[PDB]
């Protein structure tokens, strides 16, 4: 799952000049990527 | 112990800080007695 | 507009702020002198 | 643009391997509420222990009888509309289609003790309408069946609860969409009775019918489809059911008002709004179709947009 | 104007004192009125 | 057994007044006369409506509203102003789309004492007539009523015919007892006494 | 980035001069005042 | 109470940003801050 | 999906300075009997309400206004009038109506439609085709249910005119011909009434005295016993004796059944005597008070 | 700051207009919040304005506009 | 299609003991008299529901919840508090809720608001600013009639001087105490209007025809039909939410939370 | 400068693997186990 206040950041919005928003966007990206890696490995695990 | 149950919950995106906007200090005014107009009334003289 | 709006709700009236500065010394006034101050404020308000 | 719903339930009152997609599914409340409800709602001079017997003897021979009382968790939640139709197939006017429905659903389910379960459910409904605890207050509209997955004695249904019907992509055999369909015995077009016969928008109602005459109870439901709104629909059916309204108004019962008829004794029907058909005119086909090995006639609707706000409108007047 | 219930309630909570009960009491009897008057009243009056 | 003081219809004060009158045997006869008029929610509706002073006095209190022309003086850099960044959002409205522009800001005062000061100097028109408009306590759903509701309704009617501020005639079962708005206002907002 | 500030603060730091005197009295000592105040938050709005 | 205390060490000696040039008795006006 | 918009084709034989007369009539409500995407002008006339060749009346308008599909004009162009339905289940993200009534609309109220009652109908006189467009009144749900009460009370005297609201005085008038509808109104009344008096109502009657002595204890209750009332009178007139107890006692309770039967009547009473709510005003920025004539945004109910 | 009529009443004899035109800045300040006040704004909940200078301490254009200046 | 998000400036000076409850109150329903993007903390608090300079009863709330716009606490940050308006049709994605009622909500049931008619309101004390907040209860629309009738008929029996059940659970209504204090005061105005509004019916009906088995009839009838309709809908209200779960707990016990969709 | 540390913490964060299953029981999602450990302080001593 992806939670709100994060999905709103991940949505392909416009660049806001502040750096806080960019840092938070990178944080959300990394979180979703780790979750996706886990879920993709999950199939090769559970097939056995 | 604070495990995230499903995945990527809220409260991981806060960035809510507080900032010290600046300080302020003052300096005194070192007055000398002889500079004043009241010194005329007396004749100061040391006597160790 | 909003700066002036803020500036209004921040300023006390002149007819009260003016004498206090003239009764500043040891500005934790004793039990009595405060009464004289108030009894003259109740006149410096109506008078002007 | 749509809305799905999910529920895991027992498979004793419903088999998704057997109804086809587009069949309406109904949801039940906990049977334990009926106890207290009949305890303070039954009429004076009448003992609700007959309702107790009905339910108890019903649930004694349906499935794993334990988890009778509270906290059962894994309950008998959903039932098919065709099921509740075929256990009361002795009151629908078009006899032959209803009888085909009944024999087909008696042969298509587990095969053992369903004659038992059907008579149990019929007796249970009879008892509840007799103790003035009406079925319409406990049975609600869940959705239209979309997709399922079953196991040993347990199912997992996903159904359409809101929006257009044919906007729901499913992974079935023929093509990824599906349309709604109802058994041909419960279909009852309201407009035909009043002969309005006009094209345009039509609502779909879920209407119960009550005939409470002493030890001669009667409960049946149809799926109405009329031009009328939810306001005057009650007037319309109250009109073409004149004999029944008196059938309950007469056989229902200084000085006191005790002994004068109340709402509970004069009630005959209750209905709800569940959807809409916003097309140019309604087309629907009665084609005979197969439930596995038997053939039963159905109604194939088109372009039904399921509605909501499940509030029951009563008719005692 | 004629609502004195709660006021009287909150009032009957003070430090009431042992006040006399002369003008706030009433009684009766059965004798000759002169006898009642000059007897059980007038002789206990100077002590009431 | 022959009546006490604090319960009798005639307490000591009347006898005191008849003892030390110093009057003229003629107006003393009449002095007591008024002294026997009742003091009850129905007595005064008889004394006041006919020019009788029931030995009691009132202190009127009315509050008004005057339009002023203020005068403001502030000191240099008395406020620090922090300006945020504009953000735009929208939502469909009458006909089509409607946009909205918001912008957050903040402030804090840099003095130590009092930097700004105000002085109301001029005088505009008075916004409210300093007239006579009494208040009718009958609007309230207050304490204990009388015991004959006809007497309560009679009081309401009599009082409402003693001015113009009063509830409408049929009192609702529930609501706010709004007064009837007249068709024309003349001098300014009516000040209640 | 004002949208993320929980509260901005500032600091004042003032000193007061003293006056040497004779006896008898508690001798005067230098005092130090430290101050901190918070900001308020406001906004604007327009539409077309 | 008083969450405002404890954020930064109150006599924080970093650097002044501006002079005050007031030098008024302040204990009389304790009422507008920490 | 998309708002179920409806179009009504105006004829080309229209007065040039009558289209601009219909243009101003944007944001007003028209109705239908059959809901089709393509319809024509006569179907929203005054002739279309005719019961049988005769001009309808109030007690006939309150049976049409709750047996017809309400719809709101959205945009009118010369030769085409577009409107949206309401009580159908289609989304209407862009919606706005006009304050049709001479009263004020507080923010957040519920809006119910009303027939022409204040002697002032703002219809349009279409000359070429000979029609008349009846524009109902968007009256809040409370002022309505009071107007309906007064008018039905009068109609029962046709089977032997002043209201207060916000401090104003509005006096109404109608046309109470065609007795049969006024008759059926009475059977509706008595059908609401008869089900209200449950068997246990004698237990509530058992309290009429105790409600009066309690009535003399609070300033609110002695007004709930306002002079025009059967409760206080019967408390002076008809005292109640004791009664035989409950048959089948150890399980039932009559008072709960009483008020439970009464609340459903309470729900449906003004519903069938007036009309169901259709709209509720919900601004997001605009002023709360919606003066007469001004248009505002509304959401379905 | 005052109203028009009081302004006119003060510009007759009570206040002598000194200068009718003055100079004022044309650009705002700024607050950037990057770098060391950005790492600490995220790992902890604090940040200092002059954060980059206090670590060294330890160890623009204006234009002329018409106005009404007085004494 | 944008969610109608709302921001509430949660001021400072609040003891952390109160924020420890504000964080926990993540899913309760709050109402505004009018719908604004930037709202206040005094707009939510009970200090707005006052009617006659006093706190309101369980009847005044039954018009408040009809003339105010409800919203859900979506998420709380240590600075402010957010919410999404629910009454209007907005595509708000998350829109969860938590159960504040002694009743287990089944799946696929519709919910309506109901003031704290029984038991004291589980308030939240913001005394450091000088206000408190109480929230409405969430009971399935199938029980509203039952609850609001059983409690009132119990009050009537207690005037002259019982358990509700749902989905395999019985919840006692008396709550095992002599609540004839306080509870006998927070509701009486409702039954007071009730009895006087039903008594006239049994009498007006007999006034018309008594052989069924100048004190005007034509004006007492209006006061009967007007009244019984005025309350006729303040009690018979409609649903605003529906619970729809997708691989969560089958049911929700009191105190728990779940996600919903708008009706 | 161990004598000045009020308390020092170290933290962990582990992501458990998850397997794909099948069944009418709910799906599983990847958890994130956070934790925080605190340092214990001690001392020694020796004397001559």
Q: Residue G41 is encoded by which pair of tokens? A: 């938050």
Specify burial of residue D149 (Cβ count, 10 A radius: 0-12, 13-18, 19+).
middle
Q: Residue D178 is encoded by which pair of tokens? A: 């599906």
- Integer angstrom CA distances of residue I62 from D259, I135, I182, K231: 35, 14, 11, 21
F50 DSSP assignment: G
Minimal CA separation from J50 to chain B, in Å:
8
d(CA D169, CA J61): 65
Q: Residue K229 is encoded by which pair of tokens? A: 């309709």
Could you tell me which residues are beta bridge partners of residue I5? I84
Cβ-based neighbours of C36, under 8 Å, separated by 6 or more: none
d(CA G27, CA F151): 78
Contact F102 K37 (CB under 8 A): yes
d(CA H4, CA H6): 6
Residues of K in contact with B10 (CB under 8 A): 75
In this structure, the strands spanning G31-38 and L33-38 are unpaired
Minimal CA separation from G4 to chain A, in Å:
9
d(CA D62, CA D130): 22
Q: Residue D71 is encoded by which pair of tokens? A: 């906290």
Q: How far is C-alpha L45 from the geometric centre of its chain's CA atoms?
A: 31
- Integer angstrom CA distances of residue E31 from D96, E21, E42: 106, 24, 15
Find, among I219, I222, I235, I121, the residue nearest to I172 by Cα. I121
d(CA I179, CA D219): 39
The phi and psi torsions of F63 (rounded to 5 degrees) equal: -115, 135
Neighbour count for residue D223 (Cβ, 10 Å): 21
- Integer angstrom CA distances of residue A33 from A10, A21, A44, I155, K25: 12, 18, 17, 74, 31
Residues of D in contact with I66 (CB under 8 A): 229, 231-232
Best of K84, K93, K246 to substitute, by most chain A Cβ atoms within 10 angstroms, is K93
Chains J and A touch (3+ CB pairs under 8 A): yes
> Least CA distance to F80: which residue of chain B?
B21
Q: Residue D137 is encoded by which pair of tokens? A: 């207050």
Contact between J66 and J19 (Cβ < 8 Å): no
F170 DSSP assignment: S
d(CA K208, CA K202): 10
- C3 at F interface, C-beta within 8 A: yes
Q: Three-state SS string across D39-51, please?
A: HCCCCCCCCCHHH
Supply the angle between the helices D49-59 and D114-130 in degrees, to the nearest 10. Answer: 160
Minimal CA separation from D251 to chain I, in Å:
17
Chain B residues within 8 Å of chain L (Cβ atoms): 1-7
Residues of G in contact with F107 (CB under 8 A): 39-40, 42
Residues of K in contact with I273 (CB under 8 A): 225, 229
Mark which residues 66-105 of I lie under 8 Å from K by CB: 91, 93
Find, among K70, K102, K244, the residue nearest to K169 by Cα. K102
CB pairs under 8 A between B and J: 26
Best of B16, B17, B19, B25 to substitute, by most chain H Cβ atoms within 10 angstroms, is B25
3-state helix, strand, coil in chain L (%, to 5): 0, 25, 75
Residues of G in contact with K16 (CB under 8 A): none
Query: Residue I262: helix, strand or coil by DSSP?
Result: helix
- Integer angstrom CA distances of residue D41 from D35, I246, I261, J62: 10, 14, 11, 86
The residue behind tokens 């015995």 is D185
Contact between E25 and F4 (Cβ < 8 Å): yes
d(CA I134, CA I65): 11
Find, among I117, I79, I100, the residue nearest to I25 by Cα. I100
- K14 at H interface, C-beta within 8 A: yes
Contact between I22 and I124 (Cβ < 8 Å): yes
Q: How far is C-alpha K147 from the geometric centre of its chain's CA atoms?
A: 12
Cβ-based neighbours of I42, under 8 Å, separated by 6 or more: I48, I129, I131
F43 DSSP assignment: T
Q: Residue F118 is encoded by which pair of tokens? A: 């105000």
In degrees, rounded to 5, the angle at the alpha carbon of residue J53 between the alpha carbons of residues J48 and J55 is: 85
DSSP calls for F122-147: ----BSS--------GGGS--S---S
Q: Which of F85, F98, F108 sits opposite G8 (nearest CB)?
A: F108
CB pairs under 8 A between I and K: 158
Minimal CA separation from E11 to chain F, in Å:
18
d(CA I203, CA D41): 18
Q: Residue J29 is encoded by which pair of tokens? A: 């300040």
The residue behind tokens 């944080």 is A27
Residues of F in contact with C7 (CB under 8 A): 72, 74, 78-79, 116
Contact between D180 and D204 (Cβ < 8 Å): no
Cβ-based neighbours of D305, under 8 Å, separated by 6 or more: D163, D164, D165, D275, D276, D277, D278, I89
Chains E and B touch (3+ CB pairs under 8 A): no
d(CA I119, CA J33): 69
Query: Residue K18: helix, strand or coil by DSSP?
Result: helix
Method of structure determination: cryo-EM
Contact K170 D36 (CB under 8 A): yes
Residues of F in contact with J5 (CB under 8 A): 69, 122
> Least CA distance to F109: which residue of chain H?
H32
Contact between I112 and I147 (Cβ < 8 Å): no
E39 DSSP assignment: I
Q: How far is C-alpha K120 from the geometric centre of its chain's CA atoms?
A: 13
Minimal CA separation from I250 to chain D, in Å:
9
K252 DSSP assignment: B
The total number of residues shown for chain G amounts to 48
Minimal CA separation from G20 to chain F, in Å:
26
Contact F82 G2 (CB under 8 A): yes
d(CA D25, CA F89): 42
Best of F90, F91, F99, F100 to substitute, by most chain K Cβ atoms within 10 angstroms, is F91
Specify burial of residue L18 (Cβ count, 10 A radius: 0-12, 13-18, 19+).
middle
d(CA E39, CA E28): 13
Could you tell me which residues are beta bridge partners of residue I139? I112
Minimal CA separation from B23 to chain F, in Å:
10
Q: Residue I138 is encoded by which pair of tokens? A: 């968007």
Contact I69 D229 (CB under 8 A): yes
d(CA C5, CA E13): 51
Contact between D315 and D136 (Cβ < 8 Å): no
3-state helix, strand, coil in chain K (%, to 5): 30, 20, 50
K24 DSSP assignment: T
The residue behind tokens 């918009």 is I5
Contact K202 I197 (CB under 8 A): yes
Residues of B in contact with A23 (CB under 8 A): 15
d(CA D25, CA D7): 11
Contact between K3 and K91 (Cβ < 8 Å): yes
Contact between D163 and D108 (Cβ < 8 Å): no
Neighbour count for residue K121 (Cβ, 10 Å): 16
- F173 at K interface, C-beta within 8 A: yes
Find, among I19, I15, I27, I20, the residue nearest to I281 by Cα. I27
Find, among D316, D213, D223, the residue nearest to D264 by Cα. D316
Minimal CA separation from G42 to chain C, in Å:
9
Q: What subunits make at least 3 CB pairs under 8 angstroms with H?
A: B, C, F, G, J, K
DSSP calls for chain D: --EEEEEEE-SSS--TTTSPTT-EEEEE--THHHHHHHHTTSPTT--THHHHHHHHHHHTSSS---S-STT--S---EEEHHHHHHTTTTS-SSHHHHHHHHHHHHHHS-SSSHHHHHHHHHHHHHHHHHTT--GGGTEEEEEEEEEEEEETTEEEEEEEEEEESTT-----SS-S----EEETTTEE-HHHHHT----S-EEEEEEEEE---TT---EEEEEEEESS-TTTHHHHHHHTTHHHHHHHHHTT----STTS--HHHH--EEEEEEEEE-SSS---EEEEEEETTEEEEEEE----EE-----PEEE--
């Amino acid at each position: 799952a992806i939670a709100s206040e994060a999905l709103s950041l991940l949505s392909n919005t416009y660049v806001d000049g502040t750096e806080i928003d960019s840092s938070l966007r990178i944080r959300a990206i990394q979180q979703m990527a780790r979750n996706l890696r886990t879920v993709l490995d999950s199939f090769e695990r559970g097939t056995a | 112990f604070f495990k995230q149950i499903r995945s990527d919950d809220n409260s991981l995106y806060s960035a809510q800080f507080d900032i010290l906007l600046g300080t302020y200090c003052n300096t005194l005014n070192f007055v000398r007695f002889l500079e004043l107009g009241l010194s005329v009334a007396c004749i100061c003289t040391k006597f160790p | 507009d909003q700066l002036l709006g803020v500036l209004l709700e921040k300023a006390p009236p002149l007819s009260l702020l003016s004498p206090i500065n003239k009764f500043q010394p040891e500005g934790h006034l004793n039990r009595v002198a405060r009464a004289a101050l108030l009894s003259d404020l109740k006149r410096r308000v109506c008078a002007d | 643009t749509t809305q799905l719903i999910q529920q895991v339930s027992l498979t004793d009152f419903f088999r998704p391997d057997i109804e086809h997609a587009g069949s309406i599914v109904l949801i039940l409340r906990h049977p334990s509420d009926m106890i207290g409800e009949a305890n303070t709602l039954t009429q004076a001079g009448r003992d609700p222990d007959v309702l107790l017997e009905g339910l108890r003897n019903l649930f004694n021979a349906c499935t794993a009888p334990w988890t009778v009382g509270e906290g059962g968790g894994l309950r008998a939640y959903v039932t098919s509309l065709s099921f509740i139709a075929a256990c009361r197939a002795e009151e629908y006017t078009d006899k032959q289609a209803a009888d085909a429905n009944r024999t087909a659903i008696v042969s298509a389910y587990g095969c053992s003790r369903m004659e038992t379960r059907l008579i149990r459910f019929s007796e249970c409904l009879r008892a509840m309408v007799q103790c003035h605890v009406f079925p319409h207050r406990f049975i609600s509209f869940f959705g239209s069946l979309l997709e399922y997955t079953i196991q040993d004695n347990l199912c997992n249904i996903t159904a359409v609860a809101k929006g257009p019907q044919e906007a729901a992509r499913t992974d079935k055999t023929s093509t990824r969409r599906v349309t709604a369909n109802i058994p041909a015995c419960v279909f009852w077009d309201v407009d035909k009775d009043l002969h309005l016969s006009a094209d345009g928008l039509k609502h779909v109602f879920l209407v119960f019918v009550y005939t409470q005459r002493r030890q001669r109870e009667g409960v049946r439901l149809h799926l109405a489809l009329s031009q009328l709104n939810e306001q005057c629909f009650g007037r319309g059916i109250g009109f073409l059911l004149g004999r029944i309204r008196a059938e309950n108004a007469a056989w229902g019962t200084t000085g006191d008002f005790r002994g004068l008829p109340t709402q509970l004794s004069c009630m005959y029907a209750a209905y709800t709004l569940i959807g809409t058909i916003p097309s140019e005119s309604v087309r629907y086909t009665r084609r005979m179709e197969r439930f596995g090995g038997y053939n039963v006639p159905t109604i194939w609707l088109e372009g039904v947009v399921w509605g909501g706000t499940n509030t029951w409108n009563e008719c005692y007047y | 104007l004629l609502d004195v219930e709660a006021t009287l309630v909150a009032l009957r909570q003070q430090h009431l004192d042992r006040q006399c009960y002369f003008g706030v009491y009433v009684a009766e009897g059965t004798e000759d009125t002169l006898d009642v008057q000059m007897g059980r009243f007038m002789e206990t009056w100077a002590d009431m | 057994f022959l009546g006490a003081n604090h319960h009798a219809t005639i307490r000591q004060p009347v006898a005191y007044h008849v003892t030390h009158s110093k009057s003229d045997f003629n107006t003393l006869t009449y002095s007591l006369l008024g002294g026997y008029f009742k003091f009850t929610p129905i007595s005064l509706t008889h004394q006041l409506r006919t020019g009788f002073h029931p030995g009691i006095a009132f202190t009127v209190v009315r509050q008004d509203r005057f339009a002023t022309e203020q005068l403001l003086y502030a000191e240099r850099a008395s406020e620090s102003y922090f300006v945020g960044q504009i953000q735009v959002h929208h939502h469909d409205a009458i006909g089509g789309v409607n946009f909205t522009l918001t912008q957050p800001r903040a402030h804090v005062d840099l003095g130590v004492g009092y930097t700004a000061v105000c002085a109301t100097a001029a005088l505009r028109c008075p916004l409210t007539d300093m007239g006579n408009t009494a208040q009718n306590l009958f609007f309230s759903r207050g304490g204990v009523p009388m015991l004959h509701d006809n007497v309560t309704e009679s009081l309401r009617r009599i009082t409402a015919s003693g001015g113009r501020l009063n509830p409408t005639e049929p009192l609702p079962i529930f609501g706010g007892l709004r007064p009837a708005t007249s068709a024309g206002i003349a001098r300014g907002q009516a000040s209640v006494c | 980035e004002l949208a993320y500030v929980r509260d901005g603060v500032i600091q004042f730091e003032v000193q007061q001069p003293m006056i040497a005197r004779d006896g008898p009295h508690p001798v005067d000592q230098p005092v130090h005042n430290y101050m901190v105040k918070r900001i308020h938050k406001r906004s604007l709005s327009a539409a077309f | 109470s008083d969450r405002i205390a404890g954020l930064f060490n109150i006599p924080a000696g970093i650097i002044p940003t501006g002079n005050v040039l007031s030098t008024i008795e302040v204990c009389a006006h304790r009422c507008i801050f920490d | 999906a998309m708002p179920f918009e409806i179009e009504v084709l105006l004829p080309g034989e229209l007065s040039p300075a009558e289209t601009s007369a219909l243009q101003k009539c944007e944001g007003k409500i028209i109705t239908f009997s059959t809901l089709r995407h393509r319809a024509s002008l006569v179907d929203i006339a005054l002739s279309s309400y005719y019961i049988n060749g005769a001009p309808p009346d109030t007690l006939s308008l309150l049976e049409a206004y709750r047996m017809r599909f309400a719809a709101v004009i959205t945009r009118v162009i010369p030769g085409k009038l577009l409107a949206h339905a309401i009580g159908v289940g289609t989304p209407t993200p862009g919606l706005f109506i006009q304050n049709t009534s001479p009263v004020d609309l507080c923010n957040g109220d519920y809006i119910c439609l009303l027939p022409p009652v204040f002697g002032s109908a703002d219809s349009i006189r279409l000359d070429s085709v000979g029609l008349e467009i009846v524009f109902p009144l968007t009256i809040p749900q409370t002022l309505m249910r009071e107007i309906i009460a007064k008018v039905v009370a009068r109609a029962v005297e046709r089977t032997a005119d002043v209201i207060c609201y916000n401090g104003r005085r509005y006096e109404l008038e109608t046309n109470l011909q065609h007795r049969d509808g006024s008759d059926a109104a009475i059977r509706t009344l008595v059908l609401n009434l008869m089900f209200s008096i449950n068997e246990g109502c004698l237990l509530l009657l058992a309290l009429i005295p105790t409600l009066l002595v309690q009535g003399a204890h609070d300033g609110y209750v002695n007004l709930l016993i306002q002079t025009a009332n059967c409760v206080r009178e019967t408390g002076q007139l008809i005292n109640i004796p004791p009664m035989p107890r409950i048959q089948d006692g150890h399980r039932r309770f009559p008072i709960y059944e009483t008020i439970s039967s009464w609340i459903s009547t309470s729900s449906r009473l003004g519903d069938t005597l007036g009309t169901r709510a259709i709209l509720r005003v919900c601004v997001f920025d605009g002023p709360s008070t919606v003066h007469p004539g001004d248009r505002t945004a509304v959401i379905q109910v | 700051v005052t109203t028009a009529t009081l302004k006119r009443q003060l510009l007759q004899g009570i206040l002598q207009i000194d200068d009718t035109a003055a100079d004022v800045p044309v650009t705002y300040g700024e607050m950037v919040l990057q770098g060391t006040n950005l790492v600490t704004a995220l790992v902890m909940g604090k940040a200092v304005r002059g954060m980059d200078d206090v670590a060294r301490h330890l160890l623009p254009v204006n234009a002329r506009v018409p106005a009404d200046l007085v004494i």
